[PDB]
Amino acid sequence: DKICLGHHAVSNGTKVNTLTERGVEVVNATETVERTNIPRICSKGKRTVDLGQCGLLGTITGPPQCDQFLEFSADLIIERREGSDVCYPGKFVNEEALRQILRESGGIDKETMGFTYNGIRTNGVTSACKRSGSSFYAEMKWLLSNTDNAAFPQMTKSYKNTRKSPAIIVWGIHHSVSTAEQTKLYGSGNKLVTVGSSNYQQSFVPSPGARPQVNGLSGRIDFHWLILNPNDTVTFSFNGAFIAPDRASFLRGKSMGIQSGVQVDANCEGDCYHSGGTIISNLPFQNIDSRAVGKCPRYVKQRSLLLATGMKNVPE
Amino acid sequence: DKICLGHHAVSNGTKVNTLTERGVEVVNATETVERTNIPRICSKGKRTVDLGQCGLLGTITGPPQCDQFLEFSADLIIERREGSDVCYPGKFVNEEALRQILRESGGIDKETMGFTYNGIRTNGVTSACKRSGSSFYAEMKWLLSNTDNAAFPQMTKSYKNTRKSPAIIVWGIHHSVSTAEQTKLYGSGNKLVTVGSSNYQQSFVPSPGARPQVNGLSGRIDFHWLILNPNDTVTFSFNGAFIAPDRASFLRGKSMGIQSGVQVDANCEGDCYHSGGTIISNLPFQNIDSRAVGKCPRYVKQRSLLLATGMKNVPE
Amino acid sequence: DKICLGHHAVSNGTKVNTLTERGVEVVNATETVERTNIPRICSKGKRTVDLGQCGLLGTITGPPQCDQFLEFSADLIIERREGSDVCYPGKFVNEEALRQILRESGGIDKETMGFTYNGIRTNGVTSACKRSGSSFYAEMKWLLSNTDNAAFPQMTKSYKNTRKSPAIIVWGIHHSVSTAEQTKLYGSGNKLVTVGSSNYQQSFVPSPGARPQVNGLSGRIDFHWLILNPNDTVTFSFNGAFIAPDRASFLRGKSMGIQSGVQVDANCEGDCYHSGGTIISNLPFQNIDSRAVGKCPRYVKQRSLLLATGMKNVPE
Amino acid sequence: GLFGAIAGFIENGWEGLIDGWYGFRHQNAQGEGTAADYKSTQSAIDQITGKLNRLIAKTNQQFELIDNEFNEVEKQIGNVINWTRDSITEVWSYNAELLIAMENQHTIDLADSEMDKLYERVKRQLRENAEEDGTGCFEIFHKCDDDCMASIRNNTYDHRKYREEAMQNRI
Amino acid sequence: GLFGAIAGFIENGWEGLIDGWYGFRHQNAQGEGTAADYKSTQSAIDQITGKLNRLIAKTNQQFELIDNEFNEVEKQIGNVINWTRDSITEVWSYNAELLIAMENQHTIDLADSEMDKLYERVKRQLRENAEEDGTGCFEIFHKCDDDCMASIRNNTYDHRKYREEAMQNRI
Amino acid sequence: GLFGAIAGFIENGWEGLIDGWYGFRHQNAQGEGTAADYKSTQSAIDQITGKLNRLIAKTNQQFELIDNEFNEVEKQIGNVINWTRDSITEVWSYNAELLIAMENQHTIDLADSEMDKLYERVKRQLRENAEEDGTGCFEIFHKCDDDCMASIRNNTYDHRKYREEAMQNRI
Numbered sequence A, B, C: 001d002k003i004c005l006g007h008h009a010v011s012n013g014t015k016v017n018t019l020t021e022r023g024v025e026v027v028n029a030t031e032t033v034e035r036t037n038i039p040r041i042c043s044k045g046k047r048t049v050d051l052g053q054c055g056l057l058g059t060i061t062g063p064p065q066c067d068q069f070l071e072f073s074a075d076l077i078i079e080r081r082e083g084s085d086v087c088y089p090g091k092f093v094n095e096e097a098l099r100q101i102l103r104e105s106g107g108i109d110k111e112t113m114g115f116t117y118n119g120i121r122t123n124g125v126t127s128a129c130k131r132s133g134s135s136f137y138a139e140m141k142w143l144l145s146n147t148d149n150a151a152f153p154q155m156t157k158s159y160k161n162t163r164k165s166p167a168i169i170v171w172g173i174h175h176s177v178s179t180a181e182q183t184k185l186y187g188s189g190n191k192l193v194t195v196g197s198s199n200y201q202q203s204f205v206p207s208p209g210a211r212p213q214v215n216g217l218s219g220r221i222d223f224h225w226l227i228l229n230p231n232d233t234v235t236f237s238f239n240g241a242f243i244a245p246d247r248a249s250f251l252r253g254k255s256m257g258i259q260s261g262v263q264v265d266a267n268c269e270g271d272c273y274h275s276g277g278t279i280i281s282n283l284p285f286q287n288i289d290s291r292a293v294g295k296c297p298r299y300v301k302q303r304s305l306l307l308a309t310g311m312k313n314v315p316e
Numbered sequence D, E, F: 001g002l003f004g005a006i007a008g009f010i011e012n013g014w015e016g017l018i019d020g021w022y023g024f025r026h027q028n029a030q031g032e033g034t035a036a037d038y039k040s041t042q043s044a045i046d047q048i049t050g051k052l053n054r055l056i057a058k059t060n061q062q063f064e065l066i067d068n069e070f071n072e073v074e075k076q077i078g079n080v081i082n083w084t085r086d087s088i089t090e091v092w093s094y095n096a097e098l099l100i101a102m103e104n105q106h107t108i109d110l111a112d113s114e115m116d117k118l119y120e121r122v123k124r125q126l127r128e129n130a131e132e133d134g135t136g137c138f139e140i141f142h143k144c145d146d147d148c149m150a151s152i153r154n155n156t157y158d159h160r161k162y163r164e165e166a167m168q169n170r171i
């Protein structure tokens, strides 16, 4: 007559590591690194904007693509590889910082700066910026001289941020295919565009000349930008190669910017995004895109890290 | 007849978390995250300099405000929001790097570079840089043409760092309110300021034109700077828009720079500062300004993290 | 009649720290922070290149020193303090990023860009770039005007990246000791060098003037650079102060770049380098150069951290 | 590891037992019967539980891009970022690995714990009535029917009853 | 947690006892008396102690501004910094949390330890003279006055004296 | 710390013993003999072992310069880097320190463990034939020659043999 104590086991268990051992059999364990992706931007609930063929910086300049977006408003902003910030070749000076701004803007709200023009054209259009036929940027105006070679009479304009939020002021310099052609547009000599804010001053002189055809056009318009403060004034002194901003752009709020190649899906809701989809988990560690954004688990190198939830498995 | 073992307890204890539990009652515990600030720059013992209305970069240029400071000497340097690096509007090129230098300088020591001038003015003054009446920067000289529109005869000057420590060389470019007015001062044409050190070369051409009135003046003088080495020479080639440095500035030693809005207090000594005061603790974690400088505890998000110093509290 | 249980000890043991104690005697412990360096670049097995008097950026330009290296090929690349990227004084624009590229290149492979020249010189040489007598950079050509003061007829050239890998395009601007001397070489006026890629545009105008003699010469040639893509074209529009690239440079593979003052040694093989030698260890923490590169242990501040490998040492 | 019971003096353990973690196999009057101890079973479970609800956690810390997948950023800052980044990836890979081993070591030694606290409370019930067999059994020196087993199982078992019986029986 | 004593087989514990952490409540000749065990009390204390003097520590590592509260720095580098910064804040918040739980788990299980090492040394003194009551008492089967209590308390108590007495008394 | 055996109720320990970590000193018929217990000795060793093979590790993570020893980089980014760098150096210095203490605490308490699991298995062999002396010895109440010692040492020792002898002998 007798009595025995003991503990449970099973046919086969799960191997984990301990502080002193590499692979002890235990009963139940669970996985602690998220491996499973979802190939879509799980966007349930969320005010989303898929730019597609608009490039985020386009939402200020307003090329054809970015027409539906000149006053977008959002919780999430998705950027696409198809998308583009320009129509007339050129680029944005200090580009990536600006996107880092607009991605978190919650979307932008436009307001005109109120420039009219005495003694020039207000309207220069290109075959690369196509609306009905050939057009331009919607938020901007190609400022020229009245007729071929004629005077660009030296100008000054200025915009006061009325509002309590900061603005975004944009403008472009035109690098015309040659010195000969810089004249055909604006007239000759040292072509000085100057830009005084108050917490910022600086100037820009076009560098015209040869450079290979992009959209079959050999010129470039590159855009520059500043953040104009509550109460401040910007002042635009110039005499040629100037693309004048019609409107200043203010930020609505707060948003997540991501970049992706996968599609939206309103069914599944998620907060950890990357270019391959959506990391839905409750696990402390993910092994998926080490540049996952949003509220994520931690990236780790490890594929698996098994945490024990039972005792030592000992059978006969 | 019998004997019992047991342990102490108390009426009510302190709830802490363990590895497996969220809130076990224990006897004595103590708090492991510092929450208590002191609203002053606890500066006992320490050679301190409160710049106030001088801005740190002013201690090289020498505007009115920064007169008491042109050769400050310090262990701690406090910067104020009131403070300002300029009198004639403009700004410092590559600003924040320089402050990061001067904050840790232990204070600066000046030496003249020994430039005299044949065939120009040496003296240009403004109504914004007020000493007795209207004056200028003390460590600098507004170099002009002899009379209105006259020749700025092309110049070259040079300073050899005599000393074993590196120097700080400063100079300014004058962006005059217009091309018309660039003449009134220096004379006409491509106004080239050039700057050859040896571990550095570069050049500067003023961009004159319209920009809104700051201290009621529409011009700008922006300052640039280089670190001149033991034995090296700098060379200053120019023909206008040049603010010439009287003196080069050398670093005394080692200091802490902070920025703050609170006052000094020689009573309480401390090594962890931030703009809200002084974090005096021996705790491994603070939850106060995540940009606290000096020798601090670690920032954490947690407000409280209670570490146990007793057993399990068990009453009946 | 009796029986006793117990454990081993020794005359004196090794003091370690525990979670609750600072210095318990234990039997055997072992050291967990690597302190022992090896004063040589332990390079066994590895395709190594010790540049010596060539500076890494020289392997594109090709000064005298960097002649043996214009098409180096490597696993490890060692840089020396003796070494230098230039012969005609000047420097590389955006220098350190380029080295970060070439260090990991696995070495470079050159290809000519195929520019010939109608109506100028192709050949300008200096007393500082000495081959047989006085020579120049091997991968470049000092482009001048035909005779003293003569026309630099405005030019355009262009190179298409044939290959699937990206290229490195280099070119130089010549800052001639004066405006007077800028003529003697290229002819007078606004000397515009322009540079259009496609994912990049920009321009360069020389700033001539006084700056002190380096290698006994008062001029400067500074070099600029871009990464030209598969299929793309670069276009070089200019009218003076231009150093033209003979060859574009492509990357072979994958390499470790280090900087050091110690000698090679093919005997001992290692993966953790720094300027003082080679950290051979299997310890998780090193206390040696906190900028050690390669596959290292972790830097720590601690000199020693003793991990216990036995029990409590208790004698009588 | 540690504590001695699970894989140790308790020579392996029981695939039979499916009602919990811990239990009693006896033999007596009728023969063999096995019934799991729910208080030791739920003590272990409630402790593991508490770990999972710590590690399975909602990190609100948000992060955003500093970086760019499509038009790669300037070369200099790009190399700083990766560095900074990878410098961190290291830290967490370390931190994670070590956390999981530390807690698996405690998870295990925690199990061995709740077994040594059972064996050694059923020795405190069974006073001087029985003996330590070696591998995890007591010899109840006196008969214990399937109501006497059940009195040990629900912690009533008075040792006064059978002490008189075991006193001699144990000789 | 672990070890069994504190909140376990020792059914709760004593608000009465104010002379230390651990102790003996007896009853005999005179009646009840309680006196704290200073060696077990100071062993626990001296171990917790040693933790505090590790965590309450002087980090000389200095850091300085890279940052600017008054004229915010360039936008690009500013976003890198915050990132880098916040990337770290994470690490320490993790590191701190986990340290405090790890050490509270050990602080506790360390207390339970020093109690099981007392109970089970007063069983080694009291040889075959007494028995394990269940919840944390021995039955001294033979009288033990307030000088015989004190002989267990200062670790003299010879079990040879009362062995002859308990031998039968225990039947 | 913990567990009680090593530096505790086992009053110091044995410089004599050089055949392992743990062992038995006896005295009987011939006199004193000491022979190390290879299963407890190799259990401790095999556990420490497993730590070293975790910490003595090959980190393939490569890092490269962002930095420059010879022509120091721009001033602004340079100060960011050192910051970022030193911000990390902190983390690892912390992480390392704490790892080493955590594991030394467990390394030690792991040793004390394997001793309490030996003492308390040689009590399970020696049933009711012997007694707990106090400091780490049993009193074999009956003679045990240098083949009877050896039967405890290789875990055969039947307590049935000498039970009849000790039964009275122990009175």
Ligand SMILES: *[C@@H]1O[C@H](CO)[C@@H](O)[C@H](O)[C@H]1NC(C)=O
Residues within 6 Å of the ligand: A164, A230, A231
């Ligand atoms: C902005 O300027 C206007 C001037 O009409 C003033 O009334 C207002 O208070 C200023 N400041 C802010 C913060 O709005």
Ligand SMILES: *[C@@H]1O[C@H](CO)[C@@H](O)[C@H](O)[C@H]1NC(C)=O
Residues within 6 Å of the ligand: B163, B164, B230, B231
């Ligand atoms: C600097 O130059 C002088 C010139 O006489 C030279 O003698 C000396 O070696 C140099 N010393 C330092 C500290 O730079």
Ligand SMILES: *[C@@H]1O[C@H](CO)[C@@H](O)[C@H](O)[C@H]1NC(C)=O
Residues within 6 Å of the ligand: C164, C230, C231
């Ligand atoms: C490069 O250009 C050629 C034109 O001959 C084209 O056929 C090829 O697809 C292009 N791209 C690559 C990556 O080879």
Ligand SMILES: *[C@@H]1O[C@H](CO)[C@@H](O)[C@H](O)[C@H]1NC(C)=O
Residues within 6 Å of the ligand: D072, D075, D078, D079, D082
């Ligand atoms: C930084 O990280 C990713 C790794 O997936 C890589 O593709 C990217 O180009 C890296 N940056 C540089 C400059 O190599």
Ligand SMILES: *[C@@H]1O[C@H](CO)[C@@H](O)[C@H](O)[C@H]1NC(C)=O
Residues within 6 Å of the ligand: E072, E075, E078, E079, E082
């Ligand atoms: C970085 O963090 C600070 C403090 O919370 C914030 O106010 C600052 O503006 C941040 N920078 C940006 C660009 O968001």
Ligand SMILES: *[C@@H]1O[C@H](CO)[C@@H](O)[C@H](O)[C@H]1NC(C)=O
Residues within 6 Å of the ligand: F072, F078, F079, F082
């Ligand atoms: C960064 O660290 C190194 C040496 O530890 C130092 O020599 C270097 O100049 C540092 N830079 C600054 C600007 O503090």
Ligand SMILES: OC[C@H]1O[C@@H](O)[C@H](O)[C@@H](O)[C@H]1O
Residues within 6 Å of the ligand: A127, A215, A216, A217
């Ligand atoms: O867009 C490129 C080309 O398109 C044609 O339609 C146009 O007539 C040409 O002048 C040329 O510009």
Ligand SMILES: OC[C@H]1O[C@@H](O)[C@H](O)[C@@H](O)[C@H]1O
Residues within 6 Å of the ligand: B127, B215, B216, B217
């Ligand atoms: O400071 C702004 C103004 O101050 C007046 O005193 C001066 O006479 C004006 O010319 C104008 O400069």
Ligand SMILES: OC[C@H]1O[C@@H](O)[C@H](O)[C@@H](O)[C@H]1O
Residues within 6 Å of the ligand: C127, C216
């Ligand atoms: O050291 C530089 C000098 O060397 C001389 O031989 C040469 O004739 C000079 O023109 C000058 O170049």
